[PDB]
Write a protein that binds this ligand. Structure first.
Ligand SMILES: CNCc1cn(CC(=O)Nc2sc3c(c2C(N)=O)CCCC3)nc1C(C)(C)C
Ligand SMILES: N[C@@H](CCC(=O)O)C(=O)O
Ligand SMILES: N[C@@H](CCC(=O)O)C(=O)O
Lengths: 263, 263
């Protein structure tokens, strides 16, 4: 048919999408700011569509329930037709690519370790060979599934520990994992994507550090329901924006320029 | 129809595809070794097809002639139906994605600078602000087009210089650019992908260095003619291989383990 306003699902995750301080004062897309807010505006412009930003109702990225086979989070909003496109730090994975379309990656990341400054941990091997320091991941995301499915010795060891640790080492939101690192006096480390890790390291109170090399290499993609007319134009828009340096300029805007911890 | 033997186009580029020393002794796919030789075997296995490796006749990655609009290189072999799939370090670009399908990236890279050890150059800005040291790129590839199309000040400055430099700063093969760095006594720097740069840095005679940060961020994809039945299965195979750690194991095999310059 004729073009219609596109419903964009996204997720509150710094610095991708954040509530503006005065959001009560504001309406519509103007309530929100961040990398993916800016990316949404660029994509919509290059694909020539009108759009409405919506925050995913359940606050989740997307996992499938092993019993019901029902998808939750932003993936679920696409699968069940509640949203036309997901523009968020949504990790490209085999399980997801089978049910939704992803653009080529607009940003790269790998799973990484966050510690409170001074924590005697430099790697995933270090974490796996000790018990004083608890560690965990976000629920309903690609990091948890990485550990759950890993056949690699150190990560399988980590997963075995994390799955039955008490109290639970899993958190509902990134902010919750960060708070736990900050408040646990060096006794909790948080496994999260390098992009988020790197952003938080440069924010007050400047008390966290990324340590060790990334555990994997992957990327975020713009996701559309399978067969959507938006898939192709969105993919070309990502490649165009990449080649024009726009994605690099947005990364600088929302990471380096937001840095509060000095140089 | 019924499954047929797949014609794979590729390119002699270390460590992706290399002639085995005793290749005269050998036949078929056994003539060749390297990352993309191993990747081809994995993909073919996961997609359940038989295949024949073929080296691109003109030794080029792929560019389109501005007059004739004819594609050369591996892209051209796909476009004109001479090959069914390209499994090589073929950079995902807007101009190419429009005429061929790319899988999700199997490896990431950015454009980078190679110098002879001791060359007084630490960045692209440095190169652009001096004339003693010549510098250039490979012909018929994504690095040259990056500079030619760049609206970014330092790279546009570099391109203006490179396009009319005499003698020519462009080379036909990576080996030729490397030889020029090695033989020019610090007076030639070579702009090439970080992956190739990093491999060469660890090979005898151990006389080159990668300097500065990457100029861009992108990746290599497996390419198929537009609409090919191989596209979807090949893409899922890349994601599966990624998540299984196979791509990381192959990177270690062909870079770290091949290192000849010590630790
Ligand atoms: C096995 N490979 C794992 C890998 C790595 N990444 C990040 C990445 O490769 N970066 C790329 S490739 C690319 C772009 C970017 C980017 N800007 O982040 C921009 C447009 C041109 C093509 N993503 C992946 C997948 C296979 C999980 C999707
Ligand atoms: N980007 C991840 C969420 C963050 C994480 O799992 O660490 C996903 O798409 O599931
Ligand atoms: N990977 C590049 C070739 C190497 C280069 O241009 O530096 C391409 O696909 O064109």
């Amino acid at each position: 048919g004729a073009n219609k306003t596109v419903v964009v699902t996204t997720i509150l995750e710094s610095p991708y999408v954040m509530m503006k301080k005065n959001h009560e004062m504001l309406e519509g897309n103007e309530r929100y700011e961040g990398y993916c807010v800016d990316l949404a505006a660029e994509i919509a412009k290059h694909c020539g569509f009108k759009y409405k930003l919506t925050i995913v109702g359940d606050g989740k990225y997307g996992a499938r329930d092993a019993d019901t086979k029902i998808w939750n989070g932003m993936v679920g909003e696409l699968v069940y037709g509640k949203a036309d496109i997901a523009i968020a730090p949504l990790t490209i994975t085999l399980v997801r690519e089978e049910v939704i379309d992803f653009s080529k990656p607009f940003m790269s990341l790998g799973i990484s370790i966050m510690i409170k400054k001074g924590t005697p941990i430099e790697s995933a091997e270090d974490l796996s060979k000790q018990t004083e320091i608890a560690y965990g991941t976000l629920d309903s995301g690609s990091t948890k599934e990485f550990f759950r499915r890993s056949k690699i010795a150190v990560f399988d060891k980590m997963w075995t520990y994390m799955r039955s640790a008490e109290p639970s080492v899993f958190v509902r939101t990134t902010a919750e994992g960060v708070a736990r690192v900050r408040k646990s006096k060096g006794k909790y480390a948080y496994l999260l994507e390098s992009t988020m890790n790197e952003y938080i390291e440069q924010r007050k109170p400047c008390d966290t550090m990324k340590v060790g090399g990334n555990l994997d290499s992957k990327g975020y993609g713009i996701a559309t329901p399978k067969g959507s007319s938006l898939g192709t134009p969105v993919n070309l828009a990502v490649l165009k924006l990449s080649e024009q340096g726009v994605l690099d300029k947005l990364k600088n805007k929302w990471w380096y320029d937001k840095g509060e911890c000095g140089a």
